[PDB]
Structures are given as C-alpha cells and as structure tokens.
Amino acid sequence: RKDINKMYTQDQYILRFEGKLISQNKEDNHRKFIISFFCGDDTIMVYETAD
Amino acid sequence: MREVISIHVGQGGIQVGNACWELFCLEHGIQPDGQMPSDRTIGGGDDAFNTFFSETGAGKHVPRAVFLDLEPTVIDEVRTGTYRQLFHPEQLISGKEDAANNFARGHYTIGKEIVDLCLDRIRKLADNCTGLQGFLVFNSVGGGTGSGLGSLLLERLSVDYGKKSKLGFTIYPSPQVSTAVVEPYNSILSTHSLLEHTDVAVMLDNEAIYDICRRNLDIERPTYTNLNRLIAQVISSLTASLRFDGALNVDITEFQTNLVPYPRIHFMLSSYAPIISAEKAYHEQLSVAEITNSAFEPANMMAKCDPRHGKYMACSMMYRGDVVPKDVNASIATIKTKRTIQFVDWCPTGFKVGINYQPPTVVPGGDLAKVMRAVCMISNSTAIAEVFSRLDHKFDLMYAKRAFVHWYVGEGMEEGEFSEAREDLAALEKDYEEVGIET
Amino acid sequence: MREVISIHVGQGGIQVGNACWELFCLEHGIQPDGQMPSDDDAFNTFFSETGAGKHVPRAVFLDLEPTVIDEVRTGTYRQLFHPEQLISGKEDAANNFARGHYTIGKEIVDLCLDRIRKLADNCTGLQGFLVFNSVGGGTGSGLGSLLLERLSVDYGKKSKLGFTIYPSPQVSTAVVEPYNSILSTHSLLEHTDVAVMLDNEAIYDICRRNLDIERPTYTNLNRLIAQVISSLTASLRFDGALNVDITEFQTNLVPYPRIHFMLSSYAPIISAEKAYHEQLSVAEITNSAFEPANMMAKCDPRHGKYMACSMMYRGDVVPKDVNASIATIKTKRTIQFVDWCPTGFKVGINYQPPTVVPGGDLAKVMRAVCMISNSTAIAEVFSRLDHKFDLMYAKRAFVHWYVGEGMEEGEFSEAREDLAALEKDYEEVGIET
Amino acid sequence: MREIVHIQGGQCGNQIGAKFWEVISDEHGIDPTGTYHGDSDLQLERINVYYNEATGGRYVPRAILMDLEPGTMDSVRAGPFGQLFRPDNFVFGQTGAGNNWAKGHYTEGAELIDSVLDVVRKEAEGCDCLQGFQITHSLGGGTGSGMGTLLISKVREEYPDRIMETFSVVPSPKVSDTVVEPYNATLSVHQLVENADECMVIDNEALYDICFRTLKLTTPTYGDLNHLVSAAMSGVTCCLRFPGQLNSDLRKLAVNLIPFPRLHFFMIGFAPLTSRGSQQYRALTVPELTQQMFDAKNMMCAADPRHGRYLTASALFRGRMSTKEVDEQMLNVQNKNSSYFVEWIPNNIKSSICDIPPKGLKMAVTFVGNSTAIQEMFKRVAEQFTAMFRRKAFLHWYTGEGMDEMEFTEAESNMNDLVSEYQQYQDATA
Amino acid sequence: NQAKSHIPGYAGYIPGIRSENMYGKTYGKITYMSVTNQHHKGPDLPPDLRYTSTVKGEFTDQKGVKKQELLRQAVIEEAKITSSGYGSSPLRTKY
Ligand SMILES: Nc1nc2c(ncn2[C@@H]2O[C@H](COP(=O)(O)OP(=O)(O)OP(=O)(O)O)[C@@H](O)[C@H]2O)c(=O)[nH]1
C-alpha cells in the first residue's frame, strides 16, 4: 500500500535548504550543496552547484 | 542542453499556444512576471525549464516561441492580458490586414512582407539555443492566413534548415460541424503543401474533442478554452520526456524512426486517458490497465475517425506517474491478444513505450482532476484515409460549378492550381490502401 | 478475490437493492460516506477498495422512469454509489413488454453492457451474476430479459441466479401483468440458471402473523428479502465450518436443466416484544423453516413432492444438533420426497450471526436458517396464471398495445406452448417409477 | 486601424446617419460635446475606426453628409449629437434635384461632385490603412439615386481594391409616395450592379410590419425605423471594433457570401425584438435567438425566403456564449430545413462571436443572408417600369437634359439578364 | 439543507439552469453556483460584468482561483458533514 491521502494534500509543499558537506577529504570542505525535501512522500534530493 | 521552438500561426494557433504556455509556466513554477516566486530566493538547481524557456542572466525567463497573425486583435489581447510582461515584445509578430479566409491572399500577396520578419525572428531564436531538437507548428487550417502562412513558413524552413525535425498539430474541419463555408479549398491546398514538407502530422479536429469533453468532464456547454487546455495537456504529456527523468525516455527524433513506416504516410491520430471530473474521479483506482484500455477506446479519439474500419501500423504511447513496467507489459499483451483490434501483417510488433516519473500537473480553475497515472498515445492507422475521402467529396461537389474560384483567381493564383492539389490528394489516398492490403 | 455482481432493473429491483445494499453496508461496517470507520478482505466480495479509503459497490441500477433513481441521488447514500452506474432512461415502458424489449430498451442496453464489462474486468475471481427484476412490469420484464439474453451470449458459462417477483394469485396492481408474465417466463426459462419465487402476498402474511404489524409497507418486505440474500451469500465471505459457493447451488438443486425453479423460506422471524420468551433451539427454527405457512411463495408443499433442499445455518450452531433435526424431518410423515432422490439435503454452516438494522423489525437472534427448496408444488403457480392469461387472451384484449410496438401477433402462442411444456415436464418428473 | 470612412447622400441617408452616429456614440460613451466619458478601458482602443482625434481631446466622426438642398442639413445639425459633425464636411447645393435621376446624375451632379470627391479623397489619404466605404441612401429619391451612384462609380474607379458596402432603400409597391420610383430605381440598380461590392436591401414595408406586429406599439415613427436600421447596421461591424472568439470583417463576410461577382444582394435583420410588456416573459437563449432570427416574418425585406432557397448565410453572434449552442443550432436548423437550402454547397452557414453585448442587452444576433427570393423586388419594379415606360410617360423630363432612350433600353436589358441569371441558380442542381 | 450541488447524472431541475447560461464549467460547480446564488440574473448587465471578454475575465490570474476553490471545497464539506451517529440514516422515513 501507498499513503495516498498524504500525497494529495502535501504535494505542493517543498522544503529547500543550502548545505555544506562534512567529511575527511580536504578538497571537498568548500563546495556547497542545495538540499531539497519533498514532504509529499518523504523524498530527499541533493543538488551540487558549480561556481 | 535540449531546446524546442514552437510556432503558432493564426487565431487558433495563438489561442492554443496561450493555453500551452500557461500550462508550461504553471508546471515549471514560472509566475506571469517571470521570476519563480518573489519568495524562493535559492533557485539555481535542476535546470529543466531550458527546453521551453531561456534564462536572461538575472531573473526572468523568456519563452522560445513566436506568434504570427494578420488580425491585430488577438495579439493586442495577448499584449494586454496578465502575461504582458512575460513574452518578448517583438516576438509577437502581427500583420496589418487579415487574409479573410482566403488561401491566395495569405500565400501570394500578404504573407511575403511578413515572412521576412518571421524568418529573422526565427534565426534570432535559433542562434541562442545549441541543442535544438526540432520545431513545433500549430496552425488553424480552415483559416486563410493560417493556411497560407503555414504553407509559406514550412516551404521556407524546408530549405533554410533542412534536416531539422518539424511536427505538425493541425486542426482539420469536423466532418459535419464547421464555422466557415470556404474551408475545403484552402484545406486541400494546405494538405498538398504540407504533404512533402511535414515530418509528422497529428489530427486535432474539434468535434471529437467536443465529444470527449461532453461525455467525460460532463460539461454540456464547453468552449474553446477547454479544448485548448486539453490540447495543452496532450502536448505537455508528449514533451515531458525531455525535461523529466524517467525509466524510459523518448525524444522528438524517436518518432520518425519508430512510428512512421514511409515518408509519404505520416498523417496520424491521437488519444488521451484518463479524462474524468473531480466529482467522480476519486471513486476509481484509475489503474494503468483500465487507463490503457480506455486509451484504445474508439469513442475517446481526438480525431473523428474509427480505427475499427482499418488496420494499425505503429503505436507510440507515453506513460507518466507511478506506472510500473511489468503492468505496462501485461496490459500491452492483453490489448494485443484482444480480438477486436488488429495490426497490419508486415508489422508484428507495433509498440514503442516511454515512461516518465512526473505526474501530470493540475491547473486550478480547470476541469480535469489531479491524478497519478496517464497515457498519451499516437498511432498510425489506415483508417485515417476516410477523412481525406469525405473531404474530397465536399471539395468536388462544389468545385464542379466553379464556385468562389474568382476570389482565388483575382488574388494572383493560377486557376489550374486546384487540379494538381486534387491529383496529390488522389495519389495520397491511393497509397494508403496499397499498404493496407496483406502480402 | 471472489466476487458476485448484482443487477437491479425496474423500481422493484431498485427498491430491493436499496434495502440489501443498506444491509451489506451495516454488516461490513461501511459508513454511508463509503469511508471505513477505521479500527481482512471480507468486504471484497461486495465492495472494491479504490486505493485509499472508500469502497464502491459492484452494482448497476437500470430503469427508464427517473423518479425512483433520483431519490438515491438525493438520498443519504448519494456519496456511496458510483455516479455512472445508476443508469436512468427518459420514458418508462408503461407496463408494456414490447416497449421495453423492442423499441426503447435497445438504446439503453448498450450503455449497461459497457458498464457491466468495465465492472467485470476489474474483478479477478468473478463467481456469477445476480438479477433482481419485476416480471409484472414494463421495463423490469422487458429490459431484464434483453440483458439476460445478451449476457448468455457475451459471457456464457458464468452462473446466473434469479430473484424474480411474480404476481400474487389475487392481490395485484395492473390488469395486463399476465401478458408480460408469460413472455418473460419464456425468455428466462432458457437463459437463467436458478429462479426463486418472490411473490408479495406470501410475505404480507408472514409480517402480519409474526412481526405484529397491521399496516406493513414495501420497505418492510424488502428487508426480509435482504436478510434472505445475506444469509444465502454469507458463506462466500465469512468463515464457517462448512462453506458453500454459488456453484454448490448450480450442482445440488437442479436435477435437470429445464427444472430450475425453486422457492425460499426464512426462520426464525419474530418481533422483539416476544423474542425473549422462547429458547429458539436449532430444532425449533428448522421446523418453522419447513412450516408451509412460513413460505415466502404462495405454494403448498403438501400438494407436491420435494427434489432438493439446501439450508444454510449461521450463528452458534453445532453440527451434531443439526443432524438430529434432519433425522426428525425425515421421520415426519407429512413431508415426503421423490423416490429417485434418497438423500436430498445439502447443509452449510457459517459462524457469523445475523445483524440487526437500527429502526428495523426483526429482533437480534443468535441463530437463523435460510432454506432454498426445489419442489414440484411450484407448478401450481403456472396453472393459475396460465388460466388468467387464457381468460383475457380468448377475446384478444389489450393486444393492439403490443402489435403497435413491433411485436408479432404470433409471439403470444409459442410462449404459451413453452409454459404448457414446462407443466408437462414438471408433472412427468413428479411421478414415481 | 483598418478604419472605414462614412459617406451619406440624400435626406433619407442623412436621417439614417443621424441615428447611426447617435447609436455609435452611445455605444462608445461619447457625450454630445465630444468628450470621452466611458466606464471601461475596452471602449477606447478601437475608437479610431469611426472617430478622428483632434486637439483638445475631442473626437469627430469621419463622416461627410451631402445633399442638393440645405434644409435637411440645417435639421440634422440641430438634432442630438449634431455638434459632433465637422462643418467642413457639409457639402450642399442651392437648387435640388426634385426626384429626377437625370437631373441629379448629369447636370448638377457633374458640377457638384468635385468638392465632395475632394473631401473624401482628403479623408481617405489621411486615414492610416483604409478598410473600405459604407453607404446609406435611398434609391427612390432623385438626388440620392443619381449623386450617390455617380460618386460610387468615381470612388470605385479611384480605389478598386478597397471594399464597398451599401444600404439601399428600394421603393416599395404597396406603400409608394411618388410615381417616378420605377425610372430612377431601375437606373440606380443598373449603375449599382457594376460597382457595389456588397448591397443590403431595406424596405419601409418590412420596417413598418416589424414595428407594428413585433414591438406592438401603436404609432411608429421614422425615428424608430432609423433606430432599427442603425442597430442592424452596427451589428455588422461590431466585431471589427470589439474582440471575440472568432474575428470577422467585411472582407471575410464578402468572401463567404458572394459565390459570384454579379450576386451581391443580401437581406438583413436584427434579433431579438420584443415588446415592453412581453420582455419579462421571454427567456434569452441561443435557441430563442436563432428561432426568432430564421423566421421569415422578422426579415427586413418584403421578400419571403420560403419562396426561394438560401444560397448562403452568415450569422454574427454578440455577447459571451458557448460554441456548443451556436454550432449545434446552425447544424440542426440546416438539417431540419434542407428544402430551403441549396444542395451543391454543403454547410453554407457562417458564424462569428463577439464578446461585447449591446448596451441594454446581454445577447444579440445579426444575420446577413443571400437568397434567391430577393429577385421578386426586381421583377415587380421592372414590371411597373416597363408598364409605365411603354406609353412614354414622364420621358420628356428625363430626355430634356441629354438622356436618351438607349440608356433606358440597356438598363432594362441588363436588369432582366441579372434577374434571369440570378433565378437560374435557384433551379440549378448538383 | 440539501447538499450544495449534485452528482453528475442527476435528472431533475436546477432552477435557472438554461436562463442565464453558465457555460464551460464542469457541472457540480455549475449546480453549486445555482443553489447558492452567485450569478447576476436578469436581462441586463452592469458595467463591471460586461467588458470582461473570456481571455480577460478568465484564463488568467495566478492563485485567486485556487483560494476560491478551497473555500468552496470547505463550504460544501462543512454543510455535508452535519451527519453522524451509529444509527445509520433515517432511510425508512425518507425514501
Ligand atoms: N479547436 C480550436 N479551433 C480553433 C480555435 N480558434 C480558431 N479555430 C479554428 O479556426 C477556424 C477559423 O479560422 P480562425 O482560426 O478563426 O482564423 P485564421 O486561421 O487566423 O484565418 P483568418 O480568419 O483569415 O484570420 C475555425 O473553423 C476553427 O476550427 C480554437 O481556439 N480552438
């Protein structure tokens, strides 16, 4: 089964964040990311921007 | 990286392009001003609007379209409406004097001083893009300026660009319901012009869409706005494979390789499903099996032609939503084993299917309800010959007595131009049954 | 997985469908909105879950006068039924068989066939079709026969059970009921699988004698038929010791293809005022089931033989106390069987006790039995109605109403001959070797 | 843009214009002082079609009024909205024609037409992109039937490509007010057939019949007749001034309604028409509009279409509505009245939609139809003409100023040939 | 209280359904607009209603129609929600 009632009513709400990565590698402590949270079915998407 | 240029000519072309662009803007989040909202201040992600729009560098997005007409009223209406700041001011080319339902006027006398401007704007729009997939043309074939400018533009584009793909969504007159009285002449002439200059043509006659709207949406008095919205939905379903990720992608070039058998035979018919109103949409599961069963229903045709009277040659269907490939294949097997539908012998397998993840977008103030699954299907059939057959009957029945021929002769068109159009139509008709017979 | 499809034609059909689909909704707990009130696929036989929340019934309503249908659209169950399975016509047949079978029934049957195909394609384990119609009416008898004929060639081997309402011997509404009673009998004899008598005078007697109501109404009658339907079809959806399908009727109550007319009964049927003064043992209720005065059809079993009896038990019954009851029934001499049927009982047992409808008539009981019996005494109703037909056909009364609607004059003759042959077959089977 | 200038002749034409300009000014919200007082924006964008802007923010109609006597002009200036007209546009003679076609066409016509031709040339050259000309005049009057026809010939010779539209008031047989009607009517028709792109016939018989039996008001007046004519004629060009679902202009109507160049005589009407005491019981729907409009009694000509067959037709719908009702009713009436429609041209009805309803109404219909029943007008007037010409009655009044009977004979022959060829299509079959 | 619009195929009468047009809309919205009178009525037009030609008076706007629909969806449901209780509905005395 799939939760349909939630999908219909919280489809339009999208949460957008600006984030930075934390890890051991040193070259990748400066490049930034944009994080999208689709609350229609709790789906998280990550996009990486280039300068 | 991929771009497509849409061409709108005539009153019908403009009135359908308006609905198409409203749907595209609402689907991509574009406000009428151009900025996404004034509230979302991050942006800079998922560049998919590039197919239909073009970034100006900072802020607004300008569509990759051009409008053509000789009657300035519709262009002024577009320039005065809520989308005043959206369209570029000088890509909405407007003439001075209308063709007034005359093919010769819009093909030999008045179209010449506007074709230069149209080609200049087309070149300016083409220089911007780099991965131009092809051109789309919307033309009202029953109108003089529409037919004449469509013919001239297609003839010029066949030389200027050459191998670039062109798609034609024409609106032929309904078999019994029509507005004007002189439409057979310019309809036949336009058909002759576009026979050797259009890669793919789709029938969009009004009566079939009327019938679909009355039965499904349960509207007793619909108008052209509902028709335009349905056609825009069809176009969006067709084009969504470009700018949305999916399990199986199909491009514009993936039509004239898997749907058209011969260069002469590219006149096709379209169907859409499901069409249902919100007041009775939520009582059904709307499974892929039933939506694809309704897609093949002849009563849901967008062209007044019954495929039961002819054979199928190739069918292209696109699914969008949460569709499952295994259910797709099961439904395909079921419709193949269905007896009432038959294919031509020399085409054993006749299905090409593409799948997109994005569900169709619902426009507030419209008629359709928001759903999870949809299919848009384009099939080539032999039965389409009947619309040319009956249109032949109407033309000759009044051409025998040379009715209205002076109106065309006096505009600079040779009197004998009707004969070769008739011969071209006869040859096109003769071709279809030859393919239709078995080996 | 396993489903049954109900067909309702004629305002009698719709006004029985209202009661039965109210009883099914109450039994499965489904709200009038169609939403489950929140809390195991028992509802799957009658309802179909739409993906999220509500359940839409597997029913179609057909009629030509829109008056009865418009009540449903404006009633409390407007949100329950499908908007496009309540088929309504423009002009009613107006008590003419030829109108609803040859002239005005043709333009509406195609939509019904489309809807039936759409509904049946959704089901995966379809068991059969059920039909409710009024033979003594225009569009009930005419259109229903056309649907039966079309289905018998479109689907074929799917079982078809019938619940038809034949006219009472003396209590009646129209004058021309004997005419369109004959033709529909001729149509259904060779096209339906099982028929059950549902006359109206018999139930009037049951209500007055048991429920203590001096002024009953059709709505009271419809509730009893809904109870009978639910008791018959309970085993397909509720767990029990011995489960029976509708194919156990198609295999145990029809000795010959021609003989498929049977009758129904129900017990116990008592009001709440005197409900709590009897122990209501399983031995007691099975006797009332065989009581001739408890019959739901105007027939006297003592005037004929028995061929097969299928009784379904629901409640707190134990199989051992059941077997004693049949032993006593066999011991009883007032009840006699045919020679060529040594054993004649098919018994099913279900665990779910009957439900009581608020504002209803019957009392809440822990035991009930529904008995469908094939008997030779059912041939009496054909004799009296044949005589009624002959009396008014001797003078060609009301005939011009039929000839003017495209029905041939001769058609009356063959339908009469079929009834005569049916009487001959029944009387020949009733004899002993 | 694509504007049309307006020219009128004779007292009948002047009285028609006095009401038509009043109706147009009321529609566009123009006060008698010529200052805009509209309530909506949509009333100003297309105002240049009929109005010329002047310094001071005032609008002046691009109409020129002419006649051979000054009394009609002195009367029409003083009427309501009369100050709108530019005094330079009034060109009048000092003698008058006196109901004599030859007098108004040869002697004074040649020496008077120069100034009106100069002013109309100035207007046509001034306008941005001329669409065409429209005419309002009466064929039963000498000065009108002569000067207007001569001016039509001159302007058609000078501007062959532009469209020409005329509103002719042909003489009626039952209600006749002068005896010289056949002569000047026949000569005017002969001159008109060779130059007029479109011709619309109006009959005082029909106007009186409508005003007496439909509106059911006891005492009609020429004011009421002019109001009806003005509404009908404004309904033709309304869609040129206002947006709609389907735009349509005079050129489109001509293309869709004249199968042959010598067949350019129509018969028009207006709908809906209802009395004051019966306007609260009727229901305004598209079926009601088309039912009233295709009724023969409503037609603005005494020619009964049921005696002939509709060669072609066009209906202009006004106000917001659905294409369903329009197209469905057209198809339904065309199928139900197949006996009244010529068969060798299928689907011979044209439709258009303009979203702006007339002030005081929510829906309206303007119908222009070409039918072979209009020939009876020519038949009757030619019969009277030849009956009164066989005896050479009143012939000296025409022959005293250079006119000869050869012209009369050729007019008779041309008119008879027109009638014969126009009747042939009625019996023509596919 | 009725229900503020009906199911699609409901035969009957919906007051002024043919008198004042109401074209283009679905049907449930049409009959909603009739039971609750949001329409001009009468053979006349104030200046505000006229001079609103299709493309201007509809096929426009951004979200004003959206907030109108949710208001209508709320109104129709709160009117219909006035029904509850484990006694089903009085079908016996309504019929
Ligand atoms: N389906 C549909 N058809 C339309 C629409 N608009 C116009 N048409 C078609 O166009 C035909 C009339 O021609 P128009 O499009 O109005 O005018 P045109 O094509 O620009 O040609 P001209 O009249 O000379 O200016 C009608 O018969 C319609 O079939 C529309 O919005 N939807």
Ligand SMILES: Nc1nc2c(ncn2[C@@H]2O[C@H](COP(=O)(O)OP(=O)(O)OP(=O)(O)O)[C@@H](O)[C@H]2O)c(=O)[nH]1
């Ligand atoms: N028991 C019972 N009988 C009913 C009911 N409704 C109708 N009938 C029977 O139907 C008979 C009359 O035929 P109808 O069913 O009412 O009408 P019809 O079959 O649609 O035929 P037409 O009236 O021509 O349309 C009456 O004699 C009733 O006995 C009902 O709700 N309960």
Ligand SMILES: Nc1nc2c(ncn2[C@@H]2O[C@H](COP(=O)(O)OP(=O)(O)O)[C@@H](O)[C@H]2O)c(=O)[nH]1
């Ligand atoms: N409809 C209408 N017809 C008129 C009017 N005035 C005159 N007529 C008609 O014009 C005809 C006479 O025209 P006439 O006065 O000789 O025109 P003139 O020669 O140009 O001055 C009569 O038959 C009248 O019916 C008017 O105000 N309205």
Ligand SMILES: [Mg+2]
């Ligand atoms: Mg146009």
Ligand SMILES: [Mg+2]
């Ligand atoms: Mg009935």
